[model samples]
Target: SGAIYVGNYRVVNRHLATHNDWANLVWEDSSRDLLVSSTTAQGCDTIARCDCQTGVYYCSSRRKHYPVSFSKPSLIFVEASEYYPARYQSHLMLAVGHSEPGDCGGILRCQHGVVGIVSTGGNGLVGFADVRDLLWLDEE
Candidate 1:
């Protein structure tokens, strides 16, 4: 089946270039950065990881984690290119789930590496929650 009907919201910062489905982002208020999780779609996003760790996905050049609406099966992903600036020093994280008002938990890519398979605690959906939760590369 296709992605579930989660929901939608406006991106506070329309400048920060990231995956088209960033609305599913979960921020670490204390850290002021995205919580770095995956999704049910087995996909992942790469972003800039400077500072003490990874900073929060703020908005409009302001210090605010603007709530951006998103749909189900949505995730916070970044292109592999974004990491180039850091010269592969930055680590990638994933957060998988739908924008629906529910606790969307899954396998956080427990087995990570090159081309890995991250299973989820639930069914259907897989990795996309945690980049470190990867399983392994394609077997067959």
Candidate 2:
């Protein structure tokens, strides 16, 4: 299986520099900033803790709880290079199933960490629509 195809949208990773604190992660698509729970001058994207048994990302100082169910597997695109400013970065581009009539594309960045999914736009909607009610798909 490849990924959950809501529409033409698929997960793709576009590398971009991280914030000075390394807590902030920004991908090329949305140009949004996401922060991790770790508070340190050192630049690194590492999850503080993940309890797969509970399928929940525990809350931390800067991190919020996230519920992930891998029973329905999905894909996360990632990029890495020794020469890059940040050695590791990842992104999630998906159709956030909105009842609206138009597109519903949303991007999630995981550079130094992952937590809550947030966007600055009002009412939460991105302008990309895929197949309706499509949950998962294989590349084939």
Candidate 3:
């Protein structure tokens, strides 16, 4: 089985379709790219797809319509955890949510492919295996 990891700056965005106030703020101080790999590789070799145009290699998740950044070695994080893939992409989404701190439904979408019915709030979060350790976001 392939391993997973985190590779992005702390995103305060509310939704993948929307940008957070801090989205642009983080870029002011550090590099434009960051990433985490499921394997032990410096770059490219561990990721799923390479952006031929941007000269950046991205960790291939199920969705493609979001702004994701690759940090280093093998760390990656996305704007949102719950999302619907594009019509042309043959994939499903897995998601989970938390109603309160430590109180969950964290395993909200474990329905094989696309986990369904996730709660709102940052109290809990969804996790992805192909993504990393099966823990993606926290519902604050």
Candidate 4:
């Protein structure tokens, strides 16, 4: 029951998961010398920048290859678990969509590890551990 939480921005160019193949795939963002490689075995997760203007994306993993796009620049988040020896486990990826209001799924790979966009909890922002009951504060 994981529902997408929308903030204030509008997200377009939605690309649903087509194929689930654990092959060698490469995604690079020319704007930021950032690259992401997904293999069958161990791999590392990394968060990078994205250019919504051009939305130049390269995917050579599965058969259907269509460039993905975003509305504005977003904060990409990646997650990778530690492998036995030194490498990473099946790392996954999740990125924040361009600022127009909310957020959604940009890219995802692998069956292991944790990766996704998270809220920057501040004074007014909502968080995963936000306490709503004021009576709990009086226990002290």
lDDT ranking of the models: 2, 1, 3, 4
Residue-level lDDT for 63 in candidate 4: 24
Model 2 lDDT tens row, 1-140: 01112122222212222343234322133222222222223323222122121133222222443343321112333222232332222222232222121111222222323222322111332111112112221111
What C-alpha lDDT, on a 0 to 100 scale, does residue 115 get in candidate 2? Answer: 20
Candidate 1 Cα misplacement greater than 4 A, ranges? 1-57, 74-78, 84-140
Tens-digit lDDT track for model 4 on 18-127? Answer: 23311222332222212233333432332222222222222222222223322232333312212113222121122222211121222321122111221221232211
When 1 and 2 are scored with lDDT, the better candidate is 2
Off by over 4 Å in 3: 1-8, 12-130, 133-140
Once superposed on the true structure, which residue ranges of model 2 sit more than 4 Å away at CA?
1-26, 30-40, 43-54, 58-140
Q: Candidate 2: lDDT of 1? A: 7
RMSD in Å for candidate 1, one decimal? 18.1
Model 3 Cα RMSD, 1 decimal: 15.8
What's the residue-level lDDT of 87 in candidate 1?
23
How does residue 113 of candidate 4 score in lDDT? 15
Model 4 accuracy (lDDT, Cα): 0.22
For model 3, where is the 10-residue window of minimal lDDT? 50-59
Worst 10 residues of 4 by lDDT: 126-135
